[PDB]
Design a protein around this ligand. Structure first.
Ligand code: DP6
Ligand code: DP6
Lengths: 320, 320
């Protein structure tokens, strides 16, 4: 009485950010979002449901995870079991390769295999969405858009065809180590929706940002793409400074990196930064200028702190 | 054919920020503001109007100032001469003691003396306002409020009686040296008014902040004062991240200092930060905890970077 499955899902970085839920129960977002899936960072997850198990177990990189570390996985296991009318505890074994988007997407894929759900990419995106919003985009490779929809049935992601432009781009991660303890993405976006006087200004600008990203993609206009997404990310972070109590995901090193990206642009290197719910700074750059950018940034960051990535693929399912 | 006058004016730091003009010509503000005038930093200015002068001259700390460095002083000289129907060039000699608010306030006072304008404190505040908005508050000591008014006649500052509470407080300046070239306050607030999607959220919160500062003052409630003004400052800076193009006054060291103030609070030291249009971080603290705070911050900042100030007086006029 054992069912198992495995999947590999790559991380994605949002260029137009998801920030705030319209519906917490179903993870329907207040706004649509758009990301790039990356080759360098992914998660492999195997799930086993077994009648003989006595509790849910979650192992990450060989380390048994505690209740707090397992909360999103546990919530997802419960929702997928409820849907399938499955009454068995589960063991989840995940390995990160170098992580929230990729891990929940991989778990959704692994459960789809184990429980025989036979889901389409659309409906696998919808399932992954229930575990974590950003996870629903990692079902897809390259550029992907999460359409906010208005319901559980209409909120999901899809690949954005780009005439292979994504294969000419790169993201250079600047790994910043000097951060305060940060509000989680789930708690921070909720605080922002509920209390930030800047949130309406965020919402009022998302759709025209998305439209201009699509225009830039159709024309492979890198500076235009970069200007839109850099401003989008800064606007997202601006909202947390208007929350009550206000907060920031930035650390000192984040600001240092952002300032150096501006310097890089001033010295002829077209490149544009974005940040998520933490201090790391991701820099979008054309492949042809990646090495120039890495060398420039090495004047201030160690080679361990500068990790490159190219575009990556959508989810891969495996039978056990 | 020579007329001269002198004044000394102390700097002030806004606790509720002035950010954005309703009328650029007259420097009428979009919102009212509230500051504390400080003892440690001031400017002394002597002005001479003389029929024999061949151009306006501005000397600051013994250094002849160029056209860009003189622009606010030149604009003020022109407006005060036009009002007085004075046709003489002027020499302005200023010394900073340790600077925009204090320098323009001192110049307004010196011109009031030289040209025999015989202004009340209210009308001297109105005059100084035309040179720089923050200068109109340095006419007064202690706590001062700039009431936005609706006209040149109704926009001016006044002292806020506080039953001597201001004499129990201090500001510790953390002097941060790692800053990018920053947009001036005048240009940055204009860009924010004209382009920031967050500016309405700023405006919608100013008056209730002011009201709660007045309530806290009446009760000498330091944590309440501190919470309101820290959030006000962060909200002001949040608006620049929604401007087009977006920008920040923060440097890495600014973030480091803000994080350490939060740490100080966590370790039992009540203290609250605020920033203006630059990277320095000013920390409001009770006098009784100033030395504890300075020692704590010395773990990360040099003793030259930590400069204390207490409450200071209003403008002082001198005959030459
Ligand atoms: C800042 C972001 O990374 C937010 C990611 O939020 P999460 O997907 O972590 O939140 P939940 O839906 O609560 O699981 C921007 C983005 O990825 O779009
Ligand atoms: C951020 C602030 O310091 C803005 C000061 O602005 P200025 O008084 O420098 O601007 P102008 O009126 O154009 O001369 C906040 C404050 O002092 O209230």
């Amino acid at each position: 009485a054992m069912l198992s499955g495995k999947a590999r899902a790559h991380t994605n970085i949002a260029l137009i950010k998801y920030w705030g839920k319209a519906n917490e129960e179903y993870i329907l977002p207040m706004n649509s979002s758009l990301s790039l899936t990356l080759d360098a960072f992914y998660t492999e997850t195997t799930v086993t449901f077994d009648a003989h198990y006595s509790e849910d177990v979650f192992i990450l990189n060989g380390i048994l995870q505690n209740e707090k570390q397992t909360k999103k996985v546990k919530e997802f296991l419960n929702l997928v079991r409820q849907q399938a009318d499955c009454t068995w505890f589960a063991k989840v074994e995940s390995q990160n390769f170098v992580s929230s988007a990729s891990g929940l997407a991989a778990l959704a894929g692994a459960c789809n295999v184990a429980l025989g759900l036979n889901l389409s990419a659309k409906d696998l995106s919808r399932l992954a969405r229930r575990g974590s919003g950003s996870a629903c985009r990692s079902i897809f490779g390259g550029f992907a858009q999460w359409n906010k929809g208005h319901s559980d049935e209409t909120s999901f992601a899809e690949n954005i065809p780009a005439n292979n432009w994504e294969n000419e781009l790169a993201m250079l991660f600047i790994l910043i180590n000097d951060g305060e303890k940060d509000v989680s993405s789930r708690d921070g976006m909720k605080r922002t929706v509920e209390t930030s006087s800047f949130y309406q200004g965020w919402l009022d600008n998302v759709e025209k940002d998305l439209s201009q990203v699509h225009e830039a993609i159709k024309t492979k206009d890198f500076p235009r793409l970069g200007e839109i997404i850099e401003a989008n990310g800064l606007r997202m972070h601006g909202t947390t400074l208007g929350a009550v109590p206000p907060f920031t995901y930035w650390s000192p090193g984040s600001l240092q990196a952002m300032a150096l990206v501006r310097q890089a642009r001033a010295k002829g290197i077209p490149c544009y930064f974005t940040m998520d719910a933490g201090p790391n700074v991701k820099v979008l750059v054309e492949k042809k200028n990646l090495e120039a950018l890495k060398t420039f940034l090495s004047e201030h960051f160690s080679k361990e702190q500068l990790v490159p990535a190219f575009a990556g693929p959508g989810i891969e399912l495996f039978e056990t």
